[PDB]
Design a protein around this nucleic acid. Structure first.
Ligand SMILES: [Mg+2]
Ligand SMILES: [Mg+2]
Ligand SMILES: [Mg+2]
Ligand SMILES: [Mg+2]
Ligand SMILES: [Mg+2]
Ligand SMILES: [Mg+2]
Ligand SMILES: [Mg+2]
Ligand SMILES: [Mg+2]
Ligand SMILES: [Mg+2]
Ligand SMILES: [Mg+2]
Ligand SMILES: [Mg+2]
Ligand SMILES: [Mg+2]
Ligand SMILES: [Mg+2]
Ligand SMILES: [Mg+2]
Ligand SMILES: [Mg+2]
Ligand SMILES: [Mg+2]
Ligand SMILES: [Mg+2]
Ligand SMILES: [Mg+2]
Ligand SMILES: [Mg+2]
Ligand SMILES: [Mg+2]
Ligand SMILES: [Mg+2]
Ligand SMILES: [Mg+2]
Ligand SMILES: [Mg+2]
Ligand SMILES: [Mg+2]
Ligand SMILES: [Mg+2]
Ligand SMILES: [Mg+2]
Ligand SMILES: [Mg+2]
Ligand SMILES: [Mg+2]
Ligand SMILES: [Mg+2]
Ligand SMILES: [Mg+2]
Ligand SMILES: [Mg+2]
Ligand SMILES: [Mg+2]
Ligand SMILES: [Mg+2]
Ligand SMILES: [Mg+2]
Ligand SMILES: [Mg+2]
Ligand SMILES: [Mg+2]
Ligand SMILES: [Mg+2]
Ligand SMILES: [Mg+2]
Ligand SMILES: [Mg+2]
Ligand SMILES: [Mg+2]
Ligand SMILES: [Mg+2]
Ligand SMILES: [Mg+2]
Ligand SMILES: [Mg+2]
Ligand SMILES: [Mg+2]
Ligand SMILES: [Mg+2]
Ligand SMILES: [Mg+2]
Ligand SMILES: [Mg+2]
Ligand SMILES: [Zn+2]
Lengths: 97, 116, 181, 83, 23, 69
RNA sequence: GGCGACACACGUGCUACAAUGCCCACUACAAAGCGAUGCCACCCGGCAACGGGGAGCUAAUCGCAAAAAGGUGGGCCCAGUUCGGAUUGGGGUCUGCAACCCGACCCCAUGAAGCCGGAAUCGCUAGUAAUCGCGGAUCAGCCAUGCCGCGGUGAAUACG
RNA sequence: CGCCUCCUAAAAGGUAACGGAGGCGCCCAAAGGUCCCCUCAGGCGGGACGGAAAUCCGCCGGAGAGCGCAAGGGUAGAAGG
């Protein structure tokens, strides 16, 4: 299933559940989210949310950064959505000719 | 329910068929037919009634078998679970007993996966 | 009637030891056998392959006596039980056939039972009758591994003129009934 | 297990207290950090507090538990499941 | 197969000897 | 007894493994069994087939005594 | 004492689900290495792990050492089995001051899942892939199915 | 809104209200005629799978069961099987 790693930090089951609820935005596209993996970590300037996810049509790899950790998580999602919507529709572009 | 309480398969050889008894493996298949002088290749369907009762008798009076072997194995596991030793606790939980790791695998003692 | 060993054992050995141990003043007071009732409560032949006749051919081999159908008193939803369904076999054994069946029961059948420990000593009526139940039917000498498909047991009621458990305990044991305790 | 050719191991320092109690008409609660020591019939009936790394666990010794080690009776991991 | 101690092939795998693999 | 519905009881010999022979009545004239009451271990006294063990445990072990006193 | 925990989840592997296979007995053909409280010939005891004797070798000499697949012959007969070897009971060996947590190995018995694997995904272009065994470092021992090497047998396919 | 049962209904019969409660508009080729046989529910104890209750055995048990369906009456010295 979905795995969450908190590198050199400690987090609560509540925060892990928030991440799972935010990753659920990707379920919109109705494609298989295969072993999604979120890495959470703290730089000196703020938090870093990493993610690697494979789908039937490719991989999603994105990194979000921000002072506020929930915002870094959201920036991660925004980058992941635009990658997934690309994987799902790019092949449609050259139907003609 | 011939010997020794298990209707051992015919059509197969005697050394094989004896293994279909709780307490008789390959090692005791070689043993029982050596004492009673029977060709281990002969099929159970071709045992002479003398060979049967000869093979039946030695088999039952020498080793603890089916029912009584099951009772002792249980009674040994029971008392381990009663003196409260470490091997006893692992039997009181279904967890493994011979030092194996449980972070992964251990599905024989645990059973198929219990989803959360 | 016939000359059978268990019957001869009742009259020559058992009756005197009973009179001895209890002091009966009348020959009719000493306990005796009334009947043995065997009952296969099959029930797995409800609306299922109600060709339980396979079992009827088995009890008839065991007893020498064609058993009789028992039918459902009422209907039972949870058992899938409609009133009047055939759900058992009861055969009543008296006189010579009773003696012949018990002779093989004690000598042959009971020793064949898996991991046999002896009959349940507390299974007495409270009023001088005994009841034992069996799991398989290969326990009896007339049933061989070939002819039998499924495993079916029975209930066995041993009825007795003794008025008390103690007297019926004495009669049965002296006949050869093995008791664990 | 331990070679039959060698002996039945008891730390000998724990064993001293066992026999000194048997003589005096035992007993008193024995504190030990000897999980490695075999139970021996001279110990039957006593109660010995066995260190599991954190606490000394008072364990009463009976007839049936003689071939074992003292550690088998003071488990070291507290665990009550998940959930 | 190789995981079966009670056979020669299993003893070759482990790297040991015994009744089922003599020296 | 009704007719044509009952298997006829005939004189019968049952044969156990221990040479025991039983002259009784049955619907098979000759029968073979693996065990009878003349040789079954619950019947024939405390015939403990294999394990007339005792226990044997626990102090039973006795290997050995050389630990000092 | 813990790092070896265990409702779960992923990565890497080992062994398999059998007949081009499994088992037994007999019989060949390597390379690279390691080895003076070390490697151990050969003898004896034990079914065995191993133990007691005891020769040789500062080692192109003596030893680990048998290579395995293969070859010969025999068993098995399509079955959860003579497939598979997990799990557990009982009994032993050895290292070690000490194998409870928490060692490897032997023996008896137990004989699980597994009938070729969804979405998805890895490797490999020639002595390669596949398959078979051997050695070494670490090391009292060993959880090595790992790693670094060594040879045996030996393919398929590439339009583009 | 017709029909059935009980109550109201004042111990014959009958007796009203937009009084209190329920049912019918079918069914059965046996669930009918006759002859013969049989006796319940329930409680306790005993009995493989088998349970509160399947089927078996024993003891007690006048009718509390049953009688296709409401209710009432009737009923085993049968109308019940
Ligand atoms: Mg996680
Ligand atoms: Mg955390
Ligand atoms: Mg990065
Ligand atoms: Mg958006
Ligand atoms: Mg067996
Ligand atoms: Mg381990
Ligand atoms: Mg562990
Ligand atoms: Mg008389
Ligand atoms: Mg009683
Ligand atoms: Mg009576
Ligand atoms: Mg039989
Ligand atoms: Mg195998
Ligand atoms: Mg007539
Ligand atoms: Mg430690
Ligand atoms: Mg670690
Ligand atoms: Mg989880
Ligand atoms: Mg998985
Ligand atoms: Mg591995
Ligand atoms: Mg894997
Ligand atoms: Mg592999
Ligand atoms: Mg080395
Ligand atoms: Mg199996
Ligand atoms: Mg299966
Ligand atoms: Mg097998
Ligand atoms: Mg064990
Ligand atoms: Mg250890
Ligand atoms: Mg197959
Ligand atoms: Mg394969
Ligand atoms: Mg695919
Ligand atoms: Mg290339
Ligand atoms: Mg292979
Ligand atoms: Mg190697
Ligand atoms: Mg090493
Ligand atoms: Mg009118
Ligand atoms: Mg009126
Ligand atoms: Mg009135
Ligand atoms: Mg009136
Ligand atoms: Mg009038
Ligand atoms: Mg009105
Ligand atoms: Mg109406
Ligand atoms: Mg009629
Ligand atoms: Mg009753
Ligand atoms: Mg009852
Ligand atoms: Mg029951
Ligand atoms: Mg009942
Ligand atoms: Mg009534
Ligand atoms: Mg109605
Ligand atoms: Zn006999």
């Amino acid at each position: 299933t979905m795995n969450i790693t908190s590198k050199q930090m400690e987090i609560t089951p509540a925060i892990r559940q928030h991440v799972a609820d935010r990753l659920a935005k990707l379920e919109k596209w109705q494609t298989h989210l295969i072993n999604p993996h979120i890495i959470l970590s703290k730089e000196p300037q703020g938090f870093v949310a990493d993610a690697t996810i494979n789908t039937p049509n490719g991989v999603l790899v994105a990194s979000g950064k921000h002072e506020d950790m929930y915002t870094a998580i959201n920036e991660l999602i925004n980058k992941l959505e635009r990658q997934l919507n690309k994987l799902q529709h790019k092949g449609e572009a050259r139907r003609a000719a | 329910a011939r010997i020794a309480g298990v209707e051992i398969p015919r059509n197969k050889r005697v050394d094989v068929a004896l293994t279909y008894i709780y307490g008789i493996g390959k090692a005791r298949a070689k043993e029982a037919l050596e004492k009673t002088g029977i060709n281990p290749a002969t099929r159970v369907k071709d045992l002479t009634e003398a060979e049967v009762v000869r093979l039946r008798e030695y088999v039952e009076n020498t080793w603890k078998l089916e029912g009584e072997l099951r009772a002792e194995v249980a009674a040994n596991i029971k008392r381990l679970m009663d003196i409260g030793c470490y091997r006893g606790l692992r039997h009181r939980r279904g967890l493994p007993v011979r030092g194996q790791r449980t972070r992964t695998n251990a599905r024989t003692r645990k059973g198929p996966r219990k989803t959360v | 009637p016939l000359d059978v060993a268990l019957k001869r054992k009742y009259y020559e050995e058992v009756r005197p030891e009973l009179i001895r141990r209890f002091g009966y003043q009348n020959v009719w007071e000493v306990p005796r056998l009334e009947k043995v009732v065997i009952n296969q409560g099959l029930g797995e032949a409800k609306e299922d392959a109600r060709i339980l006749e396979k079992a009827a051919q088995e009890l008839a081999l065991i007893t020498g006596q064609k058993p009789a159908v028992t039918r459902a008193k009422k209907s039972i939803s949870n058992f899938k039980l409609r009133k009047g369904m055939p759900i058992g076999l009861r055969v009543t054994l008296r006189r010579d056939r009773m003696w012949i069946f018990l002779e093989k029961l004690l000598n042959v059948a009971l020793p064949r039972i898996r991991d046999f420990r002896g009959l349940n000593p507390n299974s007495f009526d409270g009023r001088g009758n005994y009841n034992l139940g069996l799991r398989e039917q290969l326990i009896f000498p007339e049933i061989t591994y070939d002819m039998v498909d499924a495993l079916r047991g029975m209930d066995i009621a041993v009825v007795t003129t003794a008025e008390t458990d103690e007297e019926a305990r004495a009669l049965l044991e002296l006949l050869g009934f093995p008791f664990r305790k | 297990p331990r070679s039959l050719k060698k002996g039945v191991f008891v730390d000998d320092h724990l064993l001293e207290k066992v026999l000194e109690l048997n003589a005096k008409g035992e007993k008193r609660l024995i504190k030990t950090w000897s999980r490695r020591s075999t139970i021996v019939p001279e110990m039957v009936g006593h109660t010995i507090a066995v260190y599991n790394g954190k606490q000394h666990v008072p364990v009463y010794i009976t007839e049936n538990m003689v071939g074992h080690k003292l550690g088998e009776f003071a488990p070291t991991r507290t665990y009550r499941g998940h959930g | 197969g190789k995981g079966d101690r009670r056979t020669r092939r299993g003893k070759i795998w482990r790297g040991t000897y015994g009744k089922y693999r003599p020296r | 007894m009704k007719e044509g519905i009952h298997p006829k009881l005939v004189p019968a010999r049952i044969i156990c493994g221990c040479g025991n022979v039983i002259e009784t009545y049955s619907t098979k004239p000759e029968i073979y069994v693996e065990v009878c009451s003349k040789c079954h271990p619950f019947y024939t006294g405390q015939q403990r087939f294999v394990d007339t063990e005792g226990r044997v445990e626990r102090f039973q072990r006795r290997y050995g005594d050389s630990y000092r006193k």
